[PDB]
Amino acid sequence: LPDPLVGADGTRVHDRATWQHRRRPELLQLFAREVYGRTPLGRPEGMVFKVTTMEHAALGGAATRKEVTVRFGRDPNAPSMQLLLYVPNAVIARAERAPVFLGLNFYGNHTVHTDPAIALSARWIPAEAPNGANHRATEAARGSDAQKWPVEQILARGYAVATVYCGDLCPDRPDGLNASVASWLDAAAGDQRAPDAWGAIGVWAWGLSRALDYLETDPLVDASRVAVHGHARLGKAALWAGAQDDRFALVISNESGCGGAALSKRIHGETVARINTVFPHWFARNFRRYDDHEEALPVDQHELLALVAPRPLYVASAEDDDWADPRGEFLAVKAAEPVFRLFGQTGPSGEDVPRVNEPSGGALRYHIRPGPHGMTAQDWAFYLAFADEWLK
Ligand SMILES: O=C(OCc1ccccc1)[C@H]1O[C@H](O)[C@H](O)[C@@H](O)[C@@H]1O
Ligand SMILES: O=C(O)[C@H]1O[C@H](O)[C@H](O)[C@@H](O)[C@@H]1O
Ligand SMILES: [Cl-]
Ligand SMILES: [Mg+2]
């Protein structure tokens, strides 16, 4: 592995200021140029927030539900995304602003809960979407992804729940960038995009920061206590959003795998060539230089993990998710751990993967659970306990 504490010019990093002001920028530029693609703008001038629905007694009175259209320019044809937010009414009643879990969803806001008041998504949805007809949402799709989205449990634990359909931002399909935030800004289609131009993971990540922009204006939530989380490909997005945007208070990667938390140079499970051929829209075209050539990579994913430091970072695996390379995810955490310890934070104790269902580490935390790829109640219990400790 490239040593996170040795700079690209061979300079060894021995102090927190050099990490922050020299090594971090260096790593951000390398991930942007060679891996994810460059994010071509931050907050758009002229972005508009419009609350389209609000219900103070949603979920049997447990929560206030808002839907917010976030439009990225004043042009009414500019792209937008639809933010679903649930705020726990008990917290509101104590005249307190709730901390927030924020993450993208795979198949639409209407899939995170059966709640029939959620607007069905009008956007293209992938064929794998349960109860989807002709790539469009259907009433039968309501709550179809609830397993990954314990909304009422999260609310009962004192957190707001914010989500956006990843396909509002970039449709998850090999040509999706052609109708996305990226094509709003860049008339190039397909593989005419610049080699260092962002792909779907960068667009998804950017959307998470725009959601945080909205949350900073919502009087019901505390935008300085946002945990950004994602599962699998959306966990890749959560990692890159949290690395680019240090406003996020805590980052959670649930089984994000190749190009997320897993070491690429391990060549275990999904490889760089495989991921770029199946998902040519996810990464920068420059990342294809490393197809069957991971040895030339100037970074590996322990350095993306390290870009969260010293903020709390939870990486987790599933024992039978070999395609994600669970031990490669653990070793990325261990290889990032020296940067966290530079800031006085600690990672997993000892040098090999902990027993299943036994989290290990302080602000840099890891667990592996039994079972197949997924996001389970046990995963969520561990994440909520982590947030309880780190979000005041
Ligand atoms: O398997 C897929 O593409 C395979 C492929 C086909 C033609 C050219 C290149 C690759 C897509 O399947 C779903 O649409 C997923 O949401 C999306 O991420 C995947 O790329
Ligand atoms: O998003 C998911 O569930 C996963 O889908 C595929 O398995 C892909 O190869 C993984 O990289 C991704 O993380
Ligand atoms: Cl619980
Ligand atoms: Mg792998």
Coordinates of C-alpha atoms in Angstrom, one line a residue, residues 19 46 65 69 75 78 124 129 144 160 182 201 217 224 236 301 315 344-345 388:
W19 CA -2.0 16.1 7.2
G46 CA -29.4 29.8 -7.6
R65 CA -42.7 14.3 7.3
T69 CA -37.8 19.6 -4.1
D75 CA -34.1 27.6 -14.6
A78 CA -32.7 22.5 -14.3
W124 CA -36.7 5.8 -14.3
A129 CA -36.6 -2.8 -8.5
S144 CA -40.3 -2.6 -1.0
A160 CA -34.3 12.3 11.8
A182 CA -23.6 15.7 -15.2
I201 CA -20.5 7.9 -7.8
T217 CA -31.9 25.6 6.5
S224 CA -24.0 19.9 12.4
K236 CA -19.2 4.2 -2.1
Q301 CA -9.1 2.8 -0.5
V315 CA -16.9 0.5 7.9
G344 CA -5.7 10.7 18.9
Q345 CA -8.5 8.4 17.6
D388 CA -25.4 7.8 20.1

